[PDB]
Write an enzyme that holds these catalytic residues in place. Structure first.
Site: not given
Ligand SMILES: *C(=O)[C@@H](NC(=O)/C(=N\OC(C)(C)C(=O)O)c1csc(N)n1)[C@@H]1N=C(C(=O)O)C(=C)CS1
Length: 244
Positions: A51, A54, A98, A190, A230
């Site tokens: 993310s 984004k 996110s 994440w 984090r």
């Molecule tokens: C951004 O980082 C988002 N992350 C994801 O969508 C990915 N994994 O997330 C899940 C499976 C929901 C997880 O919790 O691990 C992902 C994207 S590309 C990849 N190889 N995996 C959203 N962002 C966050 C954040 O902290 O920013 C989240 C807490 C999970 S959704």
């Protein structure tokens, strides 16, 4: 201030040690990068941006008029990974939560071709987005913590190749904390990986006097870890260094 660099390095290392993770946090002052933490060699290793992407997705979507900053992306009523995502939101609210589904819609309006072009043009990470626009941020695209902090630096100083106003609009979406006159702008990430999970927090501190100090935290996330670790480690580190 008279704390030794040895003591700074040991304090910040211990924040990663105490969280039972491996991580690095890179700090940029002017042209100079500094690497802190308990796994320094992570600094020039590649991981999926997750993310953190984004930030660029928003920049591209706005610059190309795929969306505006007041536009409301409606929840379509399908169950979403997190209930907090089950609501209508602007790009800015979506950044803060996110919310993948909003950012996926935006990537699809941008479309796969224009998205490759913009990613090649901004030189972001290894610049490979492959052939799925909805989800490439699981491979093939990867990036290093050094690249992320340099991306943040650019964005903070409005050096990326996008209109000034596009960059300001996106920066405004990224404000996550104010502390004693300082503002922290950043985006978390994440990602689910090969055999591990990567955790990111990439942004900058805007101090009262106007100086911007970019940073990128990168660590491995483990089962039962809260995302806010984090943040905690980031704030502790920047506090230790007197950046906030
Ligand atoms: C951004 O980082 C988002 N992350 C994801 O969508 C990915 N994994 O997330 C899940 C499976 C929901 C997880 O919790 O691990 C992902 C994207 S590309 C990849 N190889 N995996 C959203 N962002 C966050 C954040 O902290 O920013 C989240 C807490 C999970 S959704």
């Amino acid at each position: 201030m008279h704390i030794s660099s040895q003591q700074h390095e040991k304090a910040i290392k211990s924040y990663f040690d105490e969280a039972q993770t491996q991580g690095v946090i890179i700090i940029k002052e002017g042209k100079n990068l500094s690497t802190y933490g308990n796994a320094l060699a992570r600094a020039n290793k590649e991981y999926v941006p997750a993310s953190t992407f984004k930030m660029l997705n928003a920049l591209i979507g706005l610059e190309n008029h795929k969306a505006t900053t007041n536009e409301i992306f409606k929840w379509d009523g399908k169950k979403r990974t997190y209930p907090m995502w089950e609501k209508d939101m602007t790009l800015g609210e979506a950044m803060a939560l996110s919310a993948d589904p909003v950012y996926q819609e935006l990537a699809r309006r941008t479309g796969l071709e224009l998205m490759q072009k913009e990613v090649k043009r901004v030189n972001f990470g290894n610049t490979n987005i492959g052939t799925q626009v909805d989800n490439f941020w699981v491979g093939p695209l990867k990036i290093t913590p050094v690249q992320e902090v340099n991306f943040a630096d650019d964005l903070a100083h409005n050096r990326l190749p996008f209109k000034l106003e596009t960059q300001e609009e996106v920066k405004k979406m990224l404000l996550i904390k104010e502390v004693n006159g300082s503002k922290i702008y950043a985006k978390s990430g994440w990602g689910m990986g090969v055999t591990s999970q990567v955790g990111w927090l990439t942004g900058w501190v805007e101090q009262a006097n106007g100086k911007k100090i970019p940073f990128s935290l990168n660590l491995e996330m483990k089962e039962g870890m809260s995302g806010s670790i984090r943040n905690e480690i980031t704030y502790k580190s920047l506090e230790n260094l007197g950046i906030i």
